Design a protein around this ligand. Structure first.
Ligand SMILES: CO[C@@H]1O[C@@H]2CO[C@](C)(C(=O)O)O[C@H]2[C@H](O[C@@H]2O[C@H](CO)[C@@H](O[C@@H]3O[C@@H]4CO[C@](C)(C(=O)O)O[C@H]4[C@H](O)[C@@H]3NC(C)=O)[C@H](O)[C@H]2NC(C)=O)[C@@H]1NC(C)=O
Length: 170
């Protein structure tokens, strides 16, 4: 048995999770930006950062945005595509939701989204969330449309790491 705090400490020592911005603290009750979670995914699945490329037209998405190399990496990997393919908006300052997190992890772990899933997720995420719940990445009782707490994300990331180790191709 490991606590959420212990799982954070482990992932932090591994360079996967950082403290809540402005702190080095777990702050398990707080939310996380899509920018921060992009970095988490890059560190968790050992993706290569992509510098000098910008695939999004978000305000202040440029060379001066620390998150750009991570957002570009998850985009190239096919984990995240942003919220609007017309306007090319990632929403890097937006909070990562349980169902958004579910998609990234289900895609990274190569799990099959469940066809004709019945749950409270947004239509696009129904299969991704169902697959995430079935794999034990999130609880059945998690709100897919809710901002994921750092606790939920720590538990999800740790579970995804264990699944990667166990698969034979970490
Ligand atoms: C900017 O305002 C818009 O207004 C729209 C009005 O019409 C509808 C149909 C509506 O709901 O009535 O859609 C509104 C827009 O909602 C968004 O519609 C987008 C296009 O389908 C949805 O995009 C998803 O965004 C995920 C992001 O995170 C990841 C992990 C990612 O790839 O970055 O997954 C992504 C999935 O693939 C999806 N991506 C794509 C490209 O379809 C967003 O999840 C969805 N937001 C919500 C709260 O439901 C949106 N409103 C809001 C509150 O965001």
């Amino acid at each position: 048995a490991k606590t959420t705090q212990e799982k954070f400490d482990a992932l932090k020592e591994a360079g996967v999770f950082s403290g809540y911005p402005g702190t080095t603290d777990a702050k398990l009750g707080q939310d996380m930006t899509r920018a921060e979670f992009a970095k988490v995914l890059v560190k968790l699945f050992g993706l290569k950062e992509i510098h000098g490329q910008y695939s999004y037209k978000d305000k202040n998405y440029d060379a001066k945005n620390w998150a750009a190399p991570f957002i570009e990496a998850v985009t190239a990997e096919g984990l995240m595509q942003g919220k609007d393919l017309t306007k090319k908006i990632f929403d890097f300052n937006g909070k990562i939701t349980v169902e958004e997190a579910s998609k990234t992890l289900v895609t990274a772990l190569k799990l099959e989204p469940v066809k004709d899933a019945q749950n409270k997720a947004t239509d696009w995420a129904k299969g991704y969330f169902e697959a995430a719940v079935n794999a034990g990445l999130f609880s059945k009782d998690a709100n897919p449309k809710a901002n994921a707490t750092r606790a939920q994300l720590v538990e999800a990331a740790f579970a995804a790491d264990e699944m990667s180790k166990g698969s034979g191709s970490h």
